[PDB]
Amino acid sequence: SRTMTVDTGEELRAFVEGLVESGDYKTNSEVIRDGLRLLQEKTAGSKLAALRLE
Amino acid sequence: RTMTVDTGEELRAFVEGLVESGDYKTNSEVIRDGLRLLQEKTAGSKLAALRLEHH
Amino acid sequence: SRTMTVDTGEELRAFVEGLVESGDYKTNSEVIRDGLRLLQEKTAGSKLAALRLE
Amino acid sequence: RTMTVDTGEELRAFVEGLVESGDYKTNSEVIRDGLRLLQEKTAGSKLAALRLEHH
Amino acid sequence: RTMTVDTGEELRAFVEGLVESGDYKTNSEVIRDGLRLLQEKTAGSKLAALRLEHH
Amino acid sequence: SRTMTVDTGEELRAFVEGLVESGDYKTNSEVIRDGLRLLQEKTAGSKLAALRLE
Amino acid sequence: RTMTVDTGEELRAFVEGLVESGDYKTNSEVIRDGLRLLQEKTAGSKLAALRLEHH
Amino acid sequence: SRTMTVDTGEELRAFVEGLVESGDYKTNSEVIRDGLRLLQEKTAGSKLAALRLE
Amino acid sequence: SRTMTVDTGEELRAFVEGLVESGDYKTNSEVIRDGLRLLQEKTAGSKLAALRLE
Amino acid sequence: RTMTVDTGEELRAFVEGLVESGDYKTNSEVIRDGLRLLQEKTAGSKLAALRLEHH
Amino acid sequence: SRTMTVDTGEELRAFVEGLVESGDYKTNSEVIRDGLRLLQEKTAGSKLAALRLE
Amino acid sequence: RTMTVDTGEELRAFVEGLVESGDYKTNSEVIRDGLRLLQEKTAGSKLAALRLEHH
Amino acid sequence: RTMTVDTGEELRAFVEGLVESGDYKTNSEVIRDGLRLLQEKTAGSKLAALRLEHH
Amino acid sequence: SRTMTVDTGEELRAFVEGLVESGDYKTNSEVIRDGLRLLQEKTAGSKLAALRLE
Amino acid sequence: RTMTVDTGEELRAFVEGLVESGDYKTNSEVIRDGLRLLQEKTAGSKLAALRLEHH
Amino acid sequence: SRTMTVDTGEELRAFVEGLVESGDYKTNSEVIRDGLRLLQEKTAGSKLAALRLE
């Protein structure tokens, strides 16, 4: 699918809504996808170091 | 405290892969890990610093 | 306003459409905003170094 | 080769500020500068490298 | 998949402080975040590399 | 108190028990405390950057 | 706001190659990109800092 | 050929003429060539990373 | 065996007992093992650089 | 000024290996080298800095 | 004045003439001025560190 | 092995200042120091590397 | 395995200061710590690498 | 005084005598003083960080 | 302003090799280049900084 | 041979004699050899980068 319902917490929601209020982002979804890319890149690196050594 | 988000199918696949690995328990835990990363990057950035020295 | 029409070039459009095809981004607009944030952060740094020295 | 993009008002203000400074000639030049940055960041990233070693 | 751990009172205070902040949901989420950090540090270390080249 | 019961997951438990098996650590608890110190130091840094700017 | 510059043939070839690639629209855009780089390098340098503390 | 006419803008011309006034450079052309070398080196790096991975 | 008696010095003992008092560590032994891991990692690196060049 | 410590067998093997190499004279010298490293890491850390600015 | 006669050596002259042959530079003088700026920036840094500490 | 070079007055002032300091003996020694720096920067650069892999 | 060394008075003062601090037990332990540093610096250096590729 | 008798160990003596044999150093004493300067600089740094924070 | 120095044969070979390369004119120029490096390293070091804050 | 007579300059001699006065060095010759090792290591690196690429 394309939609996901997530338990964020009140503080992290306040953070997301702040990034949207600033105007650097358009929707809460754009903030969440930006965060996912950060974790994805971090995860990819470690997995790259694993395939390389091997 | 629930949020509904448009991930698309590739980033949902990525999230469900990390949960599948077992280092995370729920999809929500993956999302919060990513937002903690984004909060730290935001607070550390030069833009946040430039925006505070308009005091 | 909120909409802007830009001359991109065929190659850079191909780049944008590739990032969307990968799924890491949803619309061409999300790609353009991500790029703007990079330049914005870069610009902010240099301006921060100017106010600091002064 | 034209594209229509939803910037929002703050990032349009930012672009028009850079053109106003004179280091850039058109709004389009600002957008292309940002996409060149994003292309370089993409090509250099660890994700692009991990994605190529599935050959 | 439950584990019982001796934290002492200061590191329990630290964990409960992070949950209190709201960036985490459960004490368990804090522990798993720390173990993910430790796993990444272990895999990246020079000791793990030296230990693999006894193949 | 001093004792805490945590939901780890089978994979992360396998990781802890591997570090103990190696001998670099004595108990599962020593592994968990080492991990907490890493996150604690990481958290302290960001909080230090906040008090400093202010 | 036009300037006439002696590039030589190799650096003209380089510029026209970058325009040919499509990441740039005009020769002028390439020149301005390079001058933006040079301005940033100048402002960041230790010489610019040493020259300001003769105030 | 060897000569090129470029639209610089009033501010970037002021920048070039400032570097010449300082004496670190002799002609506007020397400033422009120095800038080109910076972009050229930057471009070469990324292209080197492309041939290397491949 | 598993137990070792070591001449530490009064100052370094005061250091160990301070890390325990802080609560980040449980026993003097946990402090000593943490220190050993640091030296062990440092030693491993140099030995890795030796096998690699060779 | 003597301390009795539970090393386990692997870290005792490591210590006795370093003494065996000859760069160290006694097991105690290895332990003190490690504690000097830990003291330097502690003093340099961000936690020690954050803990001092509660003055 | 503006002109200086310098004892370079045959090898360093060969180096200068190579940078000119490549086309990245126009005259031997442009190469020498580029080198002077490098040493000048290096010298400025150390002198900046001296005024700062004081 | 002599070369005649157009320095301009500011970079001649800089050279004669370094000789005046005493860390250098002749103007020529300053010029050679700068060219050694430029040779090292050239050999180390990414352009020199990209230019060699057209073999 | 004893060596007699000319330290001069300032570096003897430095050594005896470190022993006085208590992080070291004997003057000899200070000397060996310094030689371990020098051995690591030597093995890691570019000179040691250049000298090995004359094989 | 100026002379010190130290227990080095056979391996570290072999190291010192190797650095002398290479010719980069003249006497065993020059090797020992070079090592002391390394530890001295390392010690000074940490002590500098202590006076600075305070 | 002349100094007589005990180099040993290997470091004399090294100096004469650099002069032979042509990047330097005299043995003295090599010695001064090395002393300029040592002066910069000394001024930049943490020891020089610690020694000044006893004012 | 083993002895070399060098034109240093009054300022660089003052520098050498200062390092000797501090006590970190014993003779002017020890200072000169320390400086040579710095340049030697710097030279070796660049030559290593040349053999490696080739």
Numbering used by the authors:
A (entry chain B), C (entry chain B), F (entry chain B), H (entry chain B), I (entry chain B), K (entry chain B), ...: 3 to 56
B (entry chain A), D (entry chain A), E (entry chain A), G (entry chain A), J (entry chain A), L (entry chain A), ...: 4 to 58
Publication text:
Recently, PrpTA was found to be a pMBL6842-encoded type II TAS with the unique function to regulate the plasmid replication in Pseudoalteromonas rubra. It consists of stable PrpT toxin and labile PrpA antitoxin canonically positioned adjacently within the same operon. In this study, we reported for the first time the high-resolution structure of the PrpT:PrpA2:PrpT heterotetramer and two forms of crystal structures of truncated antitoxin-PrpA2–54. In addition, PrpA could also competitively bind to the iteron sequences in the ori, interfering with the binding of replication initiator RepB to the ori site, thus preventing the overreplication of the plasmid.
Considering the theoretical relative molecular weight of PrpT (∼11.4 kDa) and PrpA (∼11.66 kDa), our SEC-MALS results reflected that PrpTA complex, PrpAFL and PrpA2–54 present an estimated absolute mass matching tetramer, tetramer and dimer, respectively. Like other members from the RHH family, PrpA monomer polymerizes in solutions and crystals in a highly symmetrical manner via a local twofold axis to form a two-stranded antiparallel β-sheet. Moreover, the comparative structural analysis highlighted that PrpA2–54 dimers are similar to each other with an r.m.s.d. value of ∼1.38 Å over 96 residues. Thus, only the interface that existed in PrpA2–54-form II will be described in detail here. PISA analysis reflected that the hydrogen bond/salt bridge interaction network of dimerization interface is primarily offered by Met6, Val8, Asp9, Ser31, and Arg35 from each monomer together with Arg15A/B, Thr10A/B, Arg54A, Arg4B, and Asp26B for the PrpA2–54 (or symmetric Thr7A/B, Glu13A/B and asymmetric Ser3B for PrpAFL in PrpTA complex). The dimerization interface in PrpTA or PrpA2–54-form II buries roughly 1700 Å2 with the nearly identical negative ΔG value (∼24 kcal/mol) corresponding to hydrophobic interfaces. Except for the asymmetric Arg54A-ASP26B contact in PrpA2–54, the protein backbones of PrpA2–54 or PrpAFL project away from the dimer interface without further intra- or inter-contacts, suggesting the flexibility of PrpACTD. PrpA2–54-form I and II crystal structures both contain a doughnut-shaped hexadecamer formed by eight homodimers organized in a cogwheel-like form via inter-dimer interface dominated by salt bridges and hydrogen bonds. A circular hexadecamer (∼112.58 kDa) consisting of 8 PrpA2–54 dimers could be found in both forms of PrpA2–54 crystals. The maximum diameter of the annular doughnut-like hexadecamer is ∼80 Å and that of the hole in the center is approximately 22 Å.
